[PDB]
C-alpha cells in the first residue's frame, strides 16, 4: 500500500479495501501491524 | 489454434514426450529391416539373409494374403512353428500377449501431401491417424474413402479435426462403411472426450493402446473385427480386478464376493460377457467359469458366431450332456449353460467333483422366479464360487417386494452404464408416450390402477369387450401406415407389436383381428390385410416369467388355438416346425427372423421378446396391459434402437394408464433434467396457457407473448427510448424462456418447418406428412398458429443484445435490477463462425456486408469479431480461396497476424512492462477470460500502486481495454 | 511411546502374518515372528529411548550374540527391544495358535 | 496451518496454491482435476488405516488393475498406488520409501510384482546414512513413470 507513510492512520475509506482483498485477502487497517 | 500441420506437429511432440520413439524411414525395405531389428530383440533369435527372406515371404509376406488373412495373422496365427538353418522347431511371436509392456512401439508418417500419422507396433502398423481439416465434418470425411503390403496390416483408424475425434475398426465391407459404427471415447465416468489432445492424453498410454488391440479386439469366427465400447472395456477389468482381489483376500462364496455390473440394454451382452469369460479362462487358479444365460437371453446370434466356440448347445435344452462334457474335459474352461440345464443339475445332483474347484458365474438380466430358485441350491452346493451379474433393471432393495434383491446376491456395485448416457450419446432413441384416452366409455377402467378389476373383471364390460377392442384396432389400422412412415411412398416402413395379458383374452383378440382382416377387404377393400401373427404358450405386472415351450402348461385354448395360428401361418408360409420345446423354439427363432426383415407386420405376444430381443425394424408399440419398473423399461426398449436418420423416436400408444409409472420408473434412474429431456408434458400447455401452482404465476401461453411482441414492438427501429427498450426486453426474456422449453418438443420444430411452406406445395404436404407424423389436421391447426419470420427472429435478439451492451458501461432511468439478463437463453442456436464462412462462399455473385453485419450482431460472443470479419472481407478477395476450409484458414491466419500486431499496439500506447504484458495476455488467452486477481496485474499496470487518488485510471481503464481485447480474439490461436 | 505401543504394532503384524498367510505351523509362524517383531521396532532416537525409559524392558541381554561388540549402541538397544518382543510373542503365538486356528474353521 | 503459511511467505500468489485437509487415502480431491504432470511426496511411516476391507476401498477407482491391498502397519505403498492414478502420460513420480522390502509379506509381494510387471517403475535410487535426523538408516527414492525405455535401470 506504499511504494510515504512511515506511520499510518485509520482513514482507509472502507469502500475501497476490497480491491487488495480481491488480490491479497488480508486487510487489517493501515495501523494494526507489528510495526505499530 | 487451427492449422492442421501444426496440430500434427503437436501430436508428434506429445507422442515423443509420452515415449513413442519417432523414426524416419522413406523406403520399403528399411521398414523390414526395422522389423528384423525389433523381432530379434523381442524373441531373441538371429536370422541370416536366407532365413530372413524365407521368414518374410513364407510367413509374413505371402503376397496373396487378404486383409482378413492379415487380421488372422494377428490374433490366432501369430506364432510360427518356424524352422531355422539348423532345422530346429521354435515358436516365433509377433505380439507378446503375456507381458504387454515388452513390445516396443514407434511412430512414422507415410509416403506419399496429406497429413496422416501411423503407429508401428514392433515395426508393424496397426493404427492410422487421419487428420482432416476443421471445415470438413467427420461424417463427410468418413464417406470419402470408406499398396503396399505393409500398410495392409492396419487394424484401427482414428480420424479427427481437433474438435471432434472418432475411432473405428478396420473394415472393408461396404455396409460397414456406414458412419454409425464409429465411436467416440469417454472416461471411466462415461463423460465424453471429443478434443484431440485429451484423446492423446488418455487413449495413447502404451498399456491402454496395447490392451485395446490385444485383450479387447473381437476377432470372431467370421473374420469380422469389432472393437468393444469403452464402458465395456472399463467394466471388464473391474471384473478381472474383483476376481483376483477377492481371491487373495480369501473372502469367496459370500455376497461381498459377488458384485454386479449394471449396463442398460444395448450393451452387447452376447459379446461383453463372452469376452470377459474368455479373459477369465486365462487366469491360472480359475478352472471352471459358468456362462449362465436364460434361453430368453439367447437367440440365433449366440448360435451364429460361436460355431467353433460352442455349437449345438447354446439354447434352453434339458440335457446335461453338454454340461458334463465340460465338467470332465479340460481346455474348454467356459461352460455355456442355461437355466434348464442348471435346474437339472440342482435337482438331479448335489455330488459334483467341481465343488472344491474354482467356480465363476455370469448372470444376465435376471428376474425373480428362476434366479430366485437357483441361488437356493447355489448356496447349498458350492464351496468356492464367484457370482457376477449383468443387469439393466436391477432387483433393488427399494422395490424389493418381499424377496431376493441385487444387494442380497451381489451386494456392491462394480460399474454403471445408465440409460441417459446412451440417450446422451445416441445409442438409443427418445420416446413418445402420451396417453390414448380415445374411449371414455371405459374411462376409469382404461385408467384403472387398483388390482381388482384389472384381472377379476375379466369380462366384456372392463377388458374383454370385443367391440371396444376392434374400435381400438380400427384406430390402430388407421394409423398403421401413418405412424410407420408408410403413407408416404419412399420409406421402407416399420411394424408394431401388441402387449396382452392372458390366453382366452388373446383368442378373443386374434379371431376378431381376423374379423377386421375380413372387414378390411369387405368394408374397406383398400387397407391391405398384412399377415397378423401371434406367439405365446402359457405363463409359465411385476414378474416376467418365461413361457415354457412344453405342453405341460398350455391347453386347447392355448396350444390348439396356436395350432390354428400354425395353419394360418402355414396358409401363408408353409413351414416345417414341430410342437416340442425344440421345433416350436425353432419356430420362435424363424419367427424372430421374419420379423427382423419385416415380413410379418403385426405381432401379439403376452410376455416375451422383452429381455433379449433386439430390432431396429420397429418404431411403434401398442400397449393395452399394465406394467411396472423392469417390464416398463424393457417394453420401452423395443422401439428405441437407432436405425438411420429417419427413425428418431419410438411411439408407445398406452391404452392403460402408465404415464405416472413411466415418470416414477425413470425417476428411479436419472435426474430432474431427464424427465423433460425426453418427454412427459403436453404441447398445448406452454403454447396456450396453464398454471403451475407451486408459486401460482403466469405460466403463459406462448402465443399471447407472440402477439404482444408482434403488435407492441414490430421492429428494433420501433425501439428508441428507454421505456420502449425495457418494455421489449422484459417480455422478450419471457419469450425466449418459453422458447427454450418449447425447443425440446417435436411440434415446435414441426411448426418451424411449417414456417417454410409453399403454396400449396404437395411436396411439403406429402413428404411432410409421414416423415414428421403429420396429417391434414396438423395442416389446419398449425396454420392457425403463426410465427414471425427468421429475419425478425434475428433482429429481435439483436435488439435484445445491443441493449445488453447498452447495460454494459451504464454504469454511467428505468430500473434494470429487476430485469434479469439471459445468457443461457441466447445460447440457443449461436452463429459460431461456421455459418458465417459457409455463407461467405455461398454468397455469389461485395454486397454481403449487410448480411454479415446483421448476423454478427445476433450472437453475443461473436460481435467483437465484427471488427474482424468485415475488415477481413474488405481487405481480402474470396476468389483465391478454392473452398470453405481454405477461406477459414486464411481468415484465422489474418486474425492471428492482426492479433499479434494489435497486441503490440495496445501495449505500446499505454507504457506497460513488455514481459509482464506478454505473460498476462497469453495467460488470459489460454485462460479463456480475464481477471483482477494475482499480483501480475499490478506488475503490468506497472509503475504506481495507490496511494490514492485515484487509480481506477489507469487500472480499470486498461482492464476494460484488455477485456475487450479478450473478447476480440477469444477462440483463436496466435502468440 | 511406551513398550505397549510397540507391542501393539508387533501384535497386529503377528495377526497379519497368521491371518492373511493362513499358516498352521508353530515354527513357520515363529519365523513370521522373526519377520514381524523386527519390522515393528521404531527408528527415531527419542522414540527408542522413550521405550527404553518405559517399563517392561530392561537393559541387559540374555544372549550377548545379539550385541555387535562395537560402538553400535542403538543396535544393542534395538536388539534388546527385539528380544523382549520375541519373548512376548513366544507367549502371544502360543496363545494365538489355538486362539486363531480354532476360529478359522468355516 | 504452518504448511499453508509456508508457501505464503515465499512471495507466492493467492489463486491456486491450496492445501486440503484430510486423509489422502479415504478422502481424495480433486479427482476431476486432473491427471498431473508431476507429483512429489514424502509419506510418513505408521499411518495405518482400516482394511482390508471393512470399508469400500476394495472397489475404488485408483485400485482398478493392480492387486490386493496394503496392510495396516505397512501403509507406505498405499500412497504409491494412490500416486499413479494421479499422474498423466507425460510426467513422472518421485516418491520415498523404507529400504527394508524383501517382499514385505504375501500382500506386498504382489504389489512389487505389479509395479515391476509393467514399466511403472523407471528407476530406484538408494541413499546415504544417516543424512537425516536420527533414522539412522538411509531411505529409497523411487522414480516412477508411465513412460517406456524399457529396462528397469537401478541406479542405486
Domains parsed from chain B with CATH numbers: 1-26+100-226 (3.90.1570.50), 27-99 (3.90.640.50), 227-417 (3.40.50.300), 418-681 (3.40.50.300), 682-744+787-828 (1.20.58.2040), 745-786 (1.10.10.2110)
Cβ-contact B370, B606 below 8 angstroms = no
Using the 8-state DSSP alphabet, how is residue B64 labeled? T
Cell of D144: 516412477
Bridge partner list, B415: B261
- Angle subtended at Cα B834 by Cα B831 and Cα B838, rounded to the nearest 5 degrees: 115
User: What angle do the packed helices B339-348 and B321-328 form, to 10 degrees?
Assistant: 80
User: Is A16 in Cβ contact with B948 (below 8 Å)?
Assistant: yes
- Judged by DSSP in three states, D93 sits in strand
Cell of B480: 398403421
- Angle subtended at Cα B355 by Cα B354 and Cα B357, rounded to the nearest 5 degrees: 65
Least Cα separation, residue C19 to chain B (angstroms): 10
Using a CB-CB cut-off of 8 Å, the residues of chain D touching C35 are 105
Using the 8-state DSSP alphabet, how is residue D43 labeled? P
Least Cα separation, residue D135 to chain B (angstroms): 33
CA-CA distance, D145 to D37, in Å (whole number)? 10
CA-CA distance, B345 to B318, in Å (whole number)? 10
- Judged by DSSP in three states, B853 sits in helix
CA-CA distance, B274 to B314, in Å (whole number)? 12
The 10 Å Cβ neighbour count of residue B128 is 18
Q: Identify the CA nearest to B240 among candidates B295, B280, B205, B184.
A: B280
- Judged by DSSP in three states, D90 sits in coil
Cβ-contact D35, D88 below 8 angstroms = yes
Nearest to A4 among B933, B934, B947 (CB): B947
**Which residue has 418404431 as its cell numbers?**
B619
Bridge partner list, B647: none
Question: Cβ neighbours of residue B844 under 8 Å, at least 6 residues apart?
Answer: none
CA-CA distance, B861 to B227, in Å (whole number)? 40
Using the 8-state DSSP alphabet, how is residue B523 labeled? I
| Cβ density class B401-411: b for 16+ within 10 Å, e for less | eeebbbbebbe
Nearest-by-CA chain B residue for A12: B948
CA-CA distance, B42 to B671, in Å (whole number)? 52
Interface of C with B in 18-57 (CB under 8 A): 20, 22
Nearest to D68 among B101, B188, B245 (CB): B245
User: Is A23 in Cβ contact with B938 (below 8 Å)?
Assistant: yes
Alpha helices, DSSP H, located in B256-314:
272-281, 301-304
Cβ-contact B181, B642 below 8 angstroms = no
Cβ-contact B199, B185 below 8 angstroms = yes
Cβ-contact B314, B302 below 8 angstroms = yes
Its domain, for residue C89, covers 2-102
CA distances from D1 to A22, B937, D18 (A): 22, 28, 11
Bridge partner list, B489: B491
The HSE-up count of residue B386 (CA atoms within 13 Å, CB side) is 24
Question: Cβ neighbours of residue B552 under 8 Å, at least 6 residues apart?
Answer: none
Name which of B119, B207, B208, B407 to mutate to probe chain D: the one with the most chain D Cβ atoms within 10 A of its Cβ: B207
CA dihedral sign, ordered B195, B201, B206, B211? negative
CA-CA distance, B798 to B792, in Å (whole number)? 10
Q: Identify the CA nearest to B899 among candidates B960, B792, B810, B975.
A: B975
Question: Cβ neighbours of residue B564 under 8 Å, at least 6 residues apart?
Answer: none
Q: Identify the CA nearest to B214 among candidates B373, B355, B375, B98.
A: B98
Nearest-by-CA chain B residue for C106: B383
Query: By CB neighbour count within 10 A (0-12 exposed, 13-18 middle, 19+ buried), where does D41 fall?
Result: middle
- Judged by DSSP in three states, B156 sits in strand
Ramachandran area for residue B721 (φ above 0: left; ψ -120 to 50: alpha; else beta): beta
Cβ-contact B494, B564 below 8 angstroms = no
D-B interface (Cβ pairs under 8 Å ≥ 3): yes
CA-CA distance, B931 to B202, in Å (whole number)? 31
Of chain A, the end-to-end C-alpha distance in Å amounts to: 15
Cell of B288: 471352471
CA distances from B3 to B114, B598, B839, B841, B973 (A): 13, 49, 21, 20, 9
Question: Cβ neighbours of residue B351 under 8 Å, at least 6 residues apart?
Answer: none
- Residue B376 marked ligand-binding: no
Cβ-contact B179, B142 below 8 angstroms = yes
Cell of B104: 516396443
User: Is B947 in Cβ contact with A3 (below 8 Å)?
Assistant: yes
Q: Identify the CA nearest to D90 among candidates D134, D148, D33.
A: D148
B30 touches chain A (CB under 8 A): no
Q: Identify the CA nearest to D118 among candidates B797, B263, B208, B74.
A: B208
Distance of CA B115 to the CA centre of its chain: 29
Bridge partner list, B183: B167
Cell of B643: 436405425
Alpha helices, DSSP H, located in B249-328:
272-281, 301-304, 321-328
D71 touches chain C (CB under 8 A): yes
Using a CB-CB cut-off of 8 Å, the residues of chain C touching D108 are none
Nearest to B934 among D14, D58, D67 (CB): D14
CA-CA distance, C24 to B415, in Å (whole number)? 38
Distance of CA B79 to the CA centre of its chain: 38
Interface of A with B in 1-36 (CB under 8 A): 1-4, 13, 16, 19, 22-23
> How many residues does this entry show for chain B?
975
CA-CA distance, D56 to D71, in Å (whole number)? 15
D30 upstream amide cis, omega within 30 of 0: yes
B949 upstream amide cis, omega within 30 of 0: yes
**DSSP secondary structure letters along B330-394:** SS--EEEE-HHHHHHHHHH-S--GGGGS-EEEEEES--SSSHHHHHHHHHHH-SSEE--EEESS-
Question: Cβ neighbours of residue B823 under 8 Å, at least 6 residues apart?
Answer: B860
CA-CA distance, D27 to D24, in Å (whole number)? 5
Q: Return the C-alpha torsion angle B327, B329, B330, B334, nearest 10.
A: -40
Alpha helices, DSSP H, located in B785-913:
790-807, 834-842, 849-856, 866-875, 884-908
CA-CA distance, D45 to B865, in Å (whole number)? 59
Least Cα separation, residue D55 to chain B (angstroms): 11
CA-CA distance, B782 to B775, in Å (whole number)? 11
C-A interface (Cβ pairs under 8 Å ≥ 3): no
User: Is D71 in Cβ contact with C16 (below 8 Å)?
Assistant: yes
Using a CB-CB cut-off of 8 Å, the residues of chain A touching D14 are 23-25
Cβ-contact B878, B841 below 8 angstroms = yes
Q: Return the C-alpha torsion angle B149, B151, B156, B160, nearest 10.
A: -150
Of chain B, the end-to-end C-alpha distance in Å amounts to: 10
CA-CA distance, B971 to B2, in Å (whole number)? 10
Ramachandran area for residue B131 (φ above 0: left; ψ -120 to 50: alpha; else beta): beta
Q: Which chains have 3 or more CB–CB distances shorter than 8 Å to chain C?
A: B, D
Cell of C55: 517399563
Distance of CA B96 to the CA centre of its chain: 34
Cβ-contact B891, B135 below 8 angstroms = no
Query: By CB neighbour count within 10 A (0-12 exposed, 13-18 middle, 19+ buried), where does D130 fall?
Result: exposed
- Residue B266 marked ligand-binding: yes
Nearest-by-CA chain B residue for A13: B948
Question: Cβ neighbours of residue B292 under 8 Å, at least 6 residues apart?
Answer: B337, B338, B339, B342, B361, B362, B363, B364, B374
- Residue B267 marked ligand-binding: yes
CA-CA distance, B185 to B802, in Å (whole number)? 40
Q: How many domains would you assign to chain C? A: 1
User: Residues of D at the B interface (Cβ-Cβ below 8 Å)?
Assistant: 13-15, 35, 52-53, 56, 58-59, 61, 63-69, 88-90, 106-107, 110, 117-119, 146-150
Q: Identify the CA nearest to B388 among candidates B517, B284, B286, B310.
A: B286
Nearest-by-CA chain A residue for D8: A24
* CATH code of residue C60: 1.20.120.780
CA-CA distance, B662 to B419, in Å (whole number)? 14
Cell of B613: 430381443
User: Is B938 in Cβ contact with A3 (below 8 Å)?
Assistant: no
Distance of CA C83 to the CA centre of its chain: 7
Distance of CA B786 to the CA centre of its chain: 35
Strand pairing report for B124-131 and B156-160? parallel
CA-CA distance, B650 to B641, in Å (whole number)? 8
Using a CB-CB cut-off of 8 Å, the residues of chain D touching A25 are 14
Question: Cβ neighbours of residue B843 under 8 Å, at least 6 residues apart?
Answer: B851
Nearest-by-CA chain D residue for B247: D68
Amino acid at each position: 500500500i506504499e511504494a510515504d507513510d512511515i506511520k499510518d492512520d485509520a482513514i482507509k475509506t472502507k469502500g475501497y479495501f476490497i480491491y487488495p482483498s480481491q488480490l491479497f485477502c488480508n486487510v487489517a487497517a493501515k495501523a494494526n501491524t507489528n510495526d505499530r | 489454434y487451427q492449422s492442421e500441420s501444426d496440430l500434427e506437429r503437436e501430436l508428434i511432440q506429445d507422442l515423443r514426450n509420452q515415449g513413442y520413439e519417432f523414426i524416419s524411414v522413406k523406403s520399403q525395405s528399411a521398414m523390414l529391416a526395422n522389423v528384423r531389428e525389433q523381432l530379434q530383440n523381442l524373441n531373441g533369435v538371429v536370422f541370416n539373409d536366407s532365413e530372413w527372406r524365407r521368414f518374410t515371404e513364407q510367413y509374413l509376406d505371402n503376397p496373396s494374403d487378404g486383409i482378413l488373412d492379415k487380421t488372422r495373422k494377428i490374433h490366432i496365427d501369430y506364432i510360427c512353428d518356424f524352422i531355422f538353418d539348423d532345422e530346429r522347431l521354435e515358436n516365433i511371436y509377433l505380439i507378446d500377449k503375456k507381458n504387454l509392456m515388452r513390445n516396443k512401439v514407434q511412430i512414422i508418417q507415410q509416403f506419399e501431401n496429406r497429413y496422416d500419422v501411423t503407429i508401428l507396433v514392433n515395426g508393424l502398423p496397426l493404427v492410422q491417424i487421419e487428420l482432416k481439416k476443421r471445415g470438413v465434418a467427420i461424417r463427410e470425411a468418413f464417406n470419402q474413402i470408406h499398396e503396399n503390403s505393409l500398410f495392409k496390416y492396419l487394424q484401427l483408424f482414428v480420424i479427427s479435426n481437433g474438435t471432434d475425434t472418432r475411432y473405428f475398426a478396420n473394415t472393408t465391407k461396404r455396409d460397414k462403411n456406414s458412419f454409425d459404427f464409429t465411436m467416440n471415447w469417454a472416461k471411466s465416468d462415461n463423460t465424453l472426450i471429443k478434443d484431440l489432445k485429451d484423446f492423446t492424453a488418455t487413449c495413447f498410454q502404451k498399456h491402454t493402446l496395447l490392451n485395446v488391440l490385444v485383450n479387447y479386439s473381437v476377432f470372431d469366427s467370421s473374420q469380422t473385427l469389432l472393437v468393444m465400447r469403452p464402458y465395456q472395456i472399463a467394466a471388464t477389468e473391474r471384473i478381472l480386478w474383483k476376481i483376483k482381489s477377492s481371491f487373495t483376500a480369501k473372502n469367496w462364496s459370500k455376497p461381498e464376493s459377488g458384485g454386479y455390473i449394471w449396463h442398460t440394454t444395448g450393451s452387447g451382452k452376447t459379446l461383453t460377457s463372452f469376452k470377459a469369460a474368455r479373459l477369465a479362462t486365462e487366469l491360472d487358479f480359475i478352472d471352471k467359469v459358468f456362462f449362465v444365460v436364460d434361453r430368453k437371453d439367447l437367440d440365433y446370434q449366440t448360435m451364429k458366431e460361436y460355431q467353433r466356440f460352442s455349437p449345438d448347445s447354446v439354447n434352453g435344452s434339458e440335457n446335461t450332456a453338454g454340461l458334463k462334457r465340460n465338467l470332465d474335459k479340460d481346455d474348454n474352461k467356459i461352460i455355456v449353460t442355461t437355466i434348464q440345464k442348471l435346474n437339472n443339475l440342482m435337482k438331479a445332483e448335489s455330488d459334483l467333483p467341481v465343488y472344491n474347484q474354482q467356480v465363476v458365474f455370469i448372470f444376465d438380466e435376471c428376474h425373480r422366479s428362476q434366479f430366485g430358485e437357483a441361488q437356493k441350491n447355489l448356496k447349498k452346493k458350492f464351496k468356492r464360487y464367484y457370482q457376477f451379474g449383468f443387469t439393466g433393471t436391477p432387483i433393488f432393495p427399494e422395490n424389493a417386494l418381499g424377496s431376493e434383491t441385487t444387494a442380497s446376491v451381489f451386494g456392491r456395485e462394480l460399474h454403471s452404464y445408465v440409460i441417459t448416457d446412451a440417450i446422451r450419446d445416441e445409442k438409443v432413441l427418445k420416446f413418445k408416450v402420451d396417453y390414448n384416452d380415445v374411449r371414455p366409455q371405459f374411462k376409469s377402467l382404461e385408467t384403472e390402477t387398483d388390482e381388482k378389476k384389472l384381472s377379476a373383471a375379466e369380462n366384456q364390460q372392463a377388458f374383454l369387450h370385443p367391440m371396444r377392442i376392434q374400435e381400438i384396432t380400427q384406430y390402430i389400422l388407421n394409423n398403421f401406415r401413418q405412424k410407420t412412415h408408410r403413407t408416404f411412398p419412399g420409406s421402407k416402413g416399420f411394424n408394431a407389436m401388441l402387449a396382452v395379458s392372458s390366453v382366452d383374452a388373446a383368442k378373443a383378440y386374434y379371431a376378431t383381428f381376423k374379423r377386421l382382416q375380413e372387414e378390411a377387404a369387405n368394408k374397406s377393400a383398400t387397407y391391405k390385410p398384412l399377415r397378423i401373427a401371434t406367439i405365446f404358450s402359457f405363463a409359465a405386472i411385476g414378474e416376467i416369467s418365461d413361457e415354457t415351450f412344453d405342453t405341460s402348461a398350455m391347453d386347447s385354448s392355448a396350444k390348439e388355438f396356436l395350432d390354428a395360428a400354425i395353419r394360418e401361418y402355414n396358409s401363408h408360409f408353409k413351414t416345417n416346425f414341430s410342437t416340442d420345446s425344440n421345433g416350436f423354439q425353432n419356430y420362435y427363432r424363424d419367427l424372430a427372423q421374419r420379423v427382423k426383415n419385416q415380413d410379418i407386420d403385426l405381432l401379439i405376444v403376452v410376455g416375451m421378446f422383452l429381455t433379449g430381443f433386439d430390432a431396429p425394424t420397429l418404431n411403434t408399440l401398442f400397449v393395452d396391459k399394465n406394467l411396472r419398473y423392469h417390464g416398463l423399461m424393457q417394453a420401452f426398449s423395443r422401439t428405441n434402437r437407432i436405425y438411420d436418420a429417419t427413425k428418431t423416436f419410438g411411439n408407445i400408444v398406452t391404452f392403460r394408464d402408465l404415464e405416472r409409472s413411466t415418470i416414477d420408473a425413470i425417476t428411479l434412474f436419472g435426474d430432474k433434467n431427464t424427465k423433460n429431456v425426453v418427454l412427459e408434458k403436453s404441447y398445448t400447455e406452454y403454447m396456450e396457457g396453464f398454471t403451475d401452482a407451486a408459486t401460482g404465476e403466469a405460466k403463459r401461453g406462448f402465443m399471447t407473448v407472440v402477439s404482444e411482441l408482434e403488435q407492441r414492438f414490430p421492429d428494433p427501429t420501433s425501439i428508441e427510448s428507454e421505456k420502449e427498450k425495457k418494455d421489449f426486453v422484459k417480455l422478450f426474456g419471457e419469450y425466449l424462456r418459453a422458447e427454450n422449453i418449447l425447443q425440446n418438443y417435436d411440434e415446435f420444430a414441426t411448426l418451424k418447418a411449417l414456417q417454410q411452406i409453399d403454396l400449396s406445395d404437395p411436396v411439403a404436404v406429402e413428404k411432410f406428412k409421414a416423415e414428421h407424423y403429420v396429417d391434414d389436421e396438423k395442416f389446419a391447426e398449425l396454420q392457425t398458429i403463426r410465427l414471425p419470420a427468421d429475419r425478425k427472429i434475428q433482429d429481435y435478439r439483436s435488439a435484445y443484445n445491443d441493449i445488453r451492451d447498452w447495460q454494459r458501461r451504464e454504469k454511467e432511468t428505468t430500473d434494470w435490477d429487476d430485469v434479469v439478463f439471459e445468457v443461457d437463453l441466447l445460447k440457443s442456436q449461436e452463429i459460431n463462425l461456421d455459418y458465417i464462412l459457409g455463407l461467405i462462399f455461398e454468397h455469389n455473385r461485395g454486397e454481403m456486408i449487410e448480411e454479415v453485419k446483421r448476423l454478427i450482431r445476433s450472437s453475443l460472443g461473436n460481435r467483437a469479431k465484427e471488427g474482424l470479419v468485415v475488415d477481413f472481407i474488405q481487405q481480402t478477395n474470396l476468389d483465391d480461396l478454392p473452398d470453405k476450409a481454405s477461406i477459414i484458414d486464411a481468415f484465422f491466419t489474418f486474425a492471428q497476424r492482426e492479433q499479434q500486431r494489435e497486441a503490440e499496439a495496445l501495449i505500446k500506447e499505454e507504457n506497460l512492462n513488455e514481459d509482464a504484458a506478454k505473460r498476462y495476455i497469453r495467460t488470459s488467452l489460454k485462460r479463456e477470460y480475464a481477471t483482477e486477481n494475482g499480483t501480475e496485474l499490478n506488475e503490468t499496470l506497472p509503475k504506481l500502486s495507490p496511494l490514492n487518488p485515484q487509480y481506477k485510471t489507469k487500472k480499470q481503464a486498461v482492464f476494460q481495454k484488455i477485456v475487450s481485447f479478450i473478447e476480440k480474439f477469444k477462440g483463436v490461436g496466435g502468440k | 511411546m511406551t513398550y505397549n505401543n510397540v507391542f501393539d504394532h508387533a501384535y497386529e503384524m503377528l495377526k497379519e502374518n497368521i491371518r492373511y498367510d493362513d499358516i498352521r505351523d508353530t515354527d513357520d509362524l515363529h519365523d513370521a515372528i522373526h519377520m514381524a517383531a523386527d519390522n515393528a521396532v521404531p527408528h527415531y532416537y527419542a522414540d527408542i529411548f522413550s521405550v527404553m525409559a518405559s517399563e517392561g524392558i530392561d537393559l541387559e541381554f540374555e544372549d550377548s550374540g545379539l550385541m555387535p561388540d562395537t560402538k553400535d549402541v542403538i543396535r544393542i538397544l534395538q536388539a534388546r527391544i527385539y528380544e523382549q518382543l520375541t519373548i512376548d510373542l513366544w507367549e502371544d503365538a502360543e496363545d494365538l495358535l489355538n486362539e486363531y486356528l480354532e476360529e478359522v474353521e468355516e | 496451518n504452518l504448511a499453508r503459511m509456508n508457501m505464503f511467505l515465499h512471495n507466492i500468489n493467492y489463486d491456486k496454491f491450496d492445501i486440503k485437509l484430510g486423509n489422502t487415502l479415504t478422502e481424495p480431491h480433486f479427482r476431476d482435476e486432473k491427471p498431473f504432470d508431476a507429483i512429489v511426496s514424502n509419506p510418513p511411516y505408521s499411518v495405518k488405516w482400516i482394511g482390508s476391507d471393512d470399508p469400500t476401498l476394495i472397489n475404488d477407482e485408483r485400485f482398478a488393475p493392480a492387486g490386493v491391498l496394503a496392510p495396516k502397519s505397512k501403509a507406505d505403498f498405499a500412497f504409491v498406488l494412490h500416486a499413479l492414478n494421479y499422474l498423466s502420460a507425460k510426467g513422472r513420480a518421485a516418491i520415498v520409501c523404507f529400504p527394508g522390502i524383501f517382499y514385505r509379506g504375501g500382500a506386498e509381494q504382489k504389489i512389487r510384482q505389479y509395479l515391476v510387471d509393467n514399466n511403472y517403475v523407471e528407476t530406484v535410487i538408494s541413499l546415504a546414512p544417516n543424512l537425516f535426523f536420527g533414522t539412522t538408516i538411509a531411505v529409497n527414492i523411487l522414480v516412477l513413470s508411465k513412460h517406456k525405455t524399457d529396462t528397469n535401470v537401478q541406479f542405486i
